[PDB]
Amino acid sequence: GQGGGTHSQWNKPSKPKTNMKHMAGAAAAGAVVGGLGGYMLGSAMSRPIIHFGSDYEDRYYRENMHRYPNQVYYRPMDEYSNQNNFVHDCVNITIKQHTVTTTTKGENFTETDVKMMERVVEPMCITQYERESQAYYQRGSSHHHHHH
């Protein structure tokens, strides 16, 4: 047609407003879960050796080591605000499932053993960062060519 003129202009559509009904729910339902619900487990690392400095603790840790896990849980970065957020979180959680694995026989871990369990998982949770620590270190040494 003659004349014309851009009196209006289009744009890509926006997300729907939603939030109209049934706000609660979704996801899985039913507490018939023997696991931690919303968690995952990672592969083993080369089993660490704790170095407490006290003769008793470094000695004794290695005696019961077969009862302690050599794998740790993992969590998303969505939680809290720290690069290491997932680390000390998986420390606590890893032991949750592992300490009960013996209680099915009526056995338990003593205070010392349960603390030893909690201690092995500390350097194991941070080794995940160590595996990519070069992405942090080399970043200063050279301009990383992969975009970010």
Q: Give dist(CA 118, CA 88) in Å, integer.
A: 10
Contact between residue 94 and residue 121 where contact means Cβ atoms under 8 Å apart: yes
DSSP characters over 75-121:
--TTSSS-TTHHHHHHHHHHHHHHHHTTGGGT----HHHHHHHHHHH
**Structural domain includes residue 100:** yes
**Structural domain includes residue 120:** yes
Largest interatomic CA distance in the chain: 94
Q: Give dist(CA 2, CA 48) in Å, integer.
A: 79
60: domain CATH number is 1.10.790.10
Q: Which residues form the domain of 79?
A: 39-142
Task: Report phi then psi at 145, rounded to 5.
Answer: -70, -20
End-to-end CA distance of the chain: 47
- What is the residue whose two structure tokens read 């997932």? 86
Q: Which amino acid is located at 61 in the chain?
A: Y
Contact between residue 41 and residue 93 where contact means Cβ atoms under 8 Å apart: no
**Structural domain includes residue 108:** yes
Please report which helix (H) or strand (E) contains residue 73, including its range: strand 73-74
- Please list the residues that pair with 72 across neighbouring strands: none
Contact between residue 100 and residue 111 where contact means Cβ atoms under 8 Å apart: no
CA nearest neighbour of 115 among 38, 56, 43, 36? 56
**Structural domain includes residue 86:** yes
Q: Compute the Cα dihedral for 67, 70, 76, 82 and give only its sign.
A: positive
**Structural domain includes residue 34:** no
**Structural domain includes residue 27:** no
Contact between residue 48 and residue 106 where contact means Cβ atoms under 8 Å apart: no
**Structural domain includes residue 98:** yes
Q: Give dist(CA 40, CA 108) in Å, integer.
A: 24
Q: How was this structure determined?
A: NMR
CA nearest neighbour of 76 among 128, 33, 34, 117? 128
Residues in the chain, how many? Answer: 148
- Domain total of the chain: 1
**Structural domain includes residue 20:** no
φ/ψ bin of 18: left (φ > 0), alpha (ψ from -120 to 50), beta (otherwise)? left
Task: Report phi then psi at 132, rounded to 5.
Answer: -115, 10
